[PDB]
């Protein structure tokens, strides 16, 4: 490994820092909440009376096991355009709440349902925040929402004093005042009804035909989870390096019991690294601390490669009288297992040395190991 790190077939006398040693995980666990219901998507997509754009319909989804793959056979949609999360990776996440908003628009206005847009729909009818996290689904519905004599059942707002704030509804039938004379409901000259009819015919070309739209908004934040994908929950193991999947939060480490004082609305913990420190178990409501795997630095002490092939190994700042990291099969990254050298293990203030025996004489320093300890190649 020393010859590999510095690209040569020969090594001069000295001490070289090669790599780090780490302890590999031995098991994987998954922990999701205790819920079994199947919350309905078939009551949103499969309907008959999709609402107007100016009064759009909102439904809230709660404790259930959501499955975002059985909704591909509810509508001819070709695909979901998603912003915060990739549509593929939707069955492995847990969200606090889900909101489904349904309405119907024209084809050429479908591009207006996106963050940071402008128009007659993104200004007075339906506005999305710039930091949207969710998906939209639009599909053609010319077979249903059209008539030979016209479909005068959908309306859209045309005039408004000011632009809407995101996710705000403005159902009201007043009389717009665009001019000087303060009309009092006559709706005559320079005073219009704010709502405009939105008639549809089968003869119109694409981009002038009705399009049915449903948008899904998630809450990917830190709070108790309510809507989760369909993944099973294994058992819980402590005081052992494992891989964990705590409620969509993946990682690796050692899980142990905690003395912390999480408040009822608390769910996670953090130190000053913007990384998680403690977790509340979804089905037990107990606090667990997470500790990184055992790791350290390895150095190789060698004489000249033209003198001998023997080496000594220094593990940097470890208590190998208690932490020898001796493994079997696949449990540790540097796989050579130089251990079991008999009475040839030394404990230095700078770590511990394997492969060199400590003599009780004194000589001039040849190879500096540290803390006043040197090493050298000598005769017997």
């Amino acid at each position: 490994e020393t010859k590999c790190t510095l690209k040569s077939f020969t090594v001069e006398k000295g001490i070289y820092q090669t790599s780090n040693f780490r302890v590999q995980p031995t098991e994987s666990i998954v922990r999701f909440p205790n819920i079994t219901n199947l919350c309905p998507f078939h009551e949103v997509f499969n309907a008959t009376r999709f609402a107007s754009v100016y009064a759009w319909n909102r439904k809230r989804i709660s404790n259930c096991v959501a499955d975002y793959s059985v909704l591909y056979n509810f509508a001819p949609f070709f695909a979901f355009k998603c912003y915060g999360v990739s549509p593929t990776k939707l069955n492995d996440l847990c969200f606090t709440n889900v909101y489904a908003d349904s309405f119907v628009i024209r084809g050429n206005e479908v591009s207006q349902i996106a963050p940071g847009q402008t128009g007659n729909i993104a200004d007075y009818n339906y506005k999305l925040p710039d930091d949207f996290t969710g998906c939209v689904i639009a599909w053609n519905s010319n077979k249903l929402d059209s008539k030979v004599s016209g479909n005068y059942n959908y309306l859209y707002r045309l005039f408004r004093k000011s632009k809407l704030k995101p996710f705000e509804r403005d159902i009201s039938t007043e009389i717009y005042q665009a001019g000087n004379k303060p009309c009092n409901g006559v709706a005559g000259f320079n005073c219009y009804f704010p709502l405009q009819s939105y008639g549809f015919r089968p003869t119109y070309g694409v981009g002038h035909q009705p399009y049915r739209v449903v948008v899904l908004s998630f809450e990917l934040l830190h709070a108790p989870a309510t809507v989760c994908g369909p993944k099973k929950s294994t058992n819980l193991v402590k005081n052992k390096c494992v891989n964990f999947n705590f409620n969509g939060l993946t990682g690796t480490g050692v899980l142990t019991e905690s003395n912390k004082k999480f408040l009822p609305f608390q769910q996670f913990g953090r130190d000053i690294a913007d990384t998680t420190d403690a977790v509340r178990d979804p089905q037990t409501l107990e606090i667990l601390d997470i500790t990184p795997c055992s790791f350290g630095g390895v150095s190789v002490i060698t004489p000249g490669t033209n003198t001998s092939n023997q080496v000594a190994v220094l593990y940097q700042d470890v208590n190998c009288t208690e932490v020898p990291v001796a493994i079997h099969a696949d449990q540790l990254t540097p796989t050579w297992r130089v251990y079991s050298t008999g009475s040839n293990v030394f404990q230095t203030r700078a770590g511990c040395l394997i492969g060199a025996e400590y003599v009780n004489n004194s000589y001039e320093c040849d190879i500096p190991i540290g803390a006043g300890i040197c090493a050298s190649y000598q005769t017997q």
């Binding site: 820092q17 780090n20 780490r22 915060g84 999360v85 990739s86 593929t88 990776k89 492995d92 996440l93 990917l220 969509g248 939060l249 993946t250 990682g251 690796t252 050692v254 142990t256 003395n259 130190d271 000053i272 690294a273 913007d274 990384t275 601390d289 500790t291 990184p292 795997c293 790791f295 350290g296 630095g297 940097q316 700042d317 470890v318 208590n319 208690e322 932490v323 203030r349 700078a350 770590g351 500096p368 540290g370 803390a371 006043g372």
Partner: protein
């Protein structure tokens, strides 16, 4: 009765001299003064691991990081060079003597009292009374030779900054010379200058009684030796007082060792900023690699991971560059201390204002955490009288 005021700073006191055609002022007494000088000699040795710092326990991030060439062999080489230079800095200052000298069992040097600087056998560390205040008034954040791992998990309370640094791949190495054989070097240097004069710095050590050495030192600055012998006892007293009040002026002052603490503070602050820099988005979805990996498919998570990688590489290069500049500054300051030890201690210096203020007589070295302290003994004139000259 208390307020904030503004003024124009004053350059100093006012004085006028009495120059005349035939008039000369000559002193009639003298004073023995002892000052102190503090010099940094070395800094802390640190090491950084790219793989743990940038891409924590991730394989996809490691595979992406392999595509940037050798931007981490270079940082490792720079840090290793700095560490080796730090080890070499303290060898030049202290390892000036080939042998190790010892004081005689009976300590009577004509009246001069060297109790405050000679090693103390009763103390387990065998350190002078003056080099125990220097070691208690400077607090190192990390000594390095602690093998701390094993208790970061059981801290229970808010884990200290050291564990946060350690878990992210930043480590501190211990110095080669322990601060117990540096004191042996100082004892050897100081025990060979009060029993042999300056002879041990040139050839073999040759013993000589202390009063005769002091007479030689006076003769070297232009005062005849008979001045010392006729005023020996008095001079001894002026020395004993001078040492007696140099300990107190260090024991009660708030912070006299301000040069040897700024190094520790700067290194700790640099490491803390390096750790805190990890929680930055750099214009990505999130600052956690295990979050953007579990919310996006592999094709379009690579952009976010690339943003994180290219932010953290720069964040680390800035640190190594500033470390190189600071190391150069410390090397210059250590070369100065080596020269001062060779000239003030192993001999008598004729340069003005180099080895303290006044006419230089002697100097004594002491060791402080990451630095050296010089006690300069100088001769100052005193009460002067007017005279007519031709």
């Amino acid at each position: 009765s208390q307020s904030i005021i503004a003024y124009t700073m004053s350059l100093g006191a006012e004085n006028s001299v009495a120059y005349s055609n035939n008039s000369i002022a000559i002193p009639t007494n003298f004073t023995i003064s002892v000052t102190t000088e503090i010099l940094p000699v070395s800094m802390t040795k640190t090491s950084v691991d790219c793989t743990m710092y940038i891409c924590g326990d991730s394989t996809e991030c490691s595979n992406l990081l392999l595509q940037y060439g050798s931007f981490c062999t270079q940082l490792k080489r720079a840090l290793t060079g700095i560490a080796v230079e730090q080890d070499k800095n303290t060898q030049e200052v202290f390892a000036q003597v080939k042998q190790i000298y010892k004081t005689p069992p009976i300590k009577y040097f004509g009246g001069f009292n060297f109790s405050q600087i000679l090693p103390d056998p009763s103390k387990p560390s065998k350190r002078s009374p003056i080099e125990d205040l220097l070691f208690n008034k400077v607090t190192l954040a990390d000594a390095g030779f602690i093998k701390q791992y094993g208790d970061c998990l059981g801290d229970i309370a808010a884990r200290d900054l050291i564990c946060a640094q350690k878990f992210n791949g930043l480590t501190v190495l211990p110095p080669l010379l322990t601060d117990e054989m540096i004191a042996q070097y100082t004892s050897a240097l100081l025990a060979g200058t009060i029993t042999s004069g300056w002879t041990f710095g040139a050839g073999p050590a040759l013993q000589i009684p202390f009063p005769m050495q002091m007479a030689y030192r006076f003769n070297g600055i232009g005062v005849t030796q008979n001045v010392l012998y006729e005023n020996q006892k008095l001079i001894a007293n002026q020395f004993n007082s001078a040492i007696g009040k140099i300990q107190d002026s260090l024991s009660s002052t708030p912070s006299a060792l301000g040069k040897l603490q700024d190094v520790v503070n700067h290194n700790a602050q640099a490491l803390n900023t390096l750790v805190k820099q990890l929680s930055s988005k750099f214009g990505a979805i999130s600052s956690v690699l295990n979050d953007i990996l579990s919310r996006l498919d592999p094709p379009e998570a690579e952009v976010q991971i690339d943003r994180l990688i290219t932010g953290r590489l720069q964040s680390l290069q800035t640190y190594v560059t500033q470390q190189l500049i600071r190391a150069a500054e410390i090397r210059a300051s250590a070369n100065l201390a080596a020269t001062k030890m060779s000239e003030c201690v192993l001999g008598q210096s004729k340069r003005v204002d180099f080895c303290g203020k006044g006419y230089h007589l002697m100097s004594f070295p002491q060791s402080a955490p990451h630095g050296v302290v010089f006690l300069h003994v100088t001769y100052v004139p005193a009460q002067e009288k007017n005279f007519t000259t031709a």
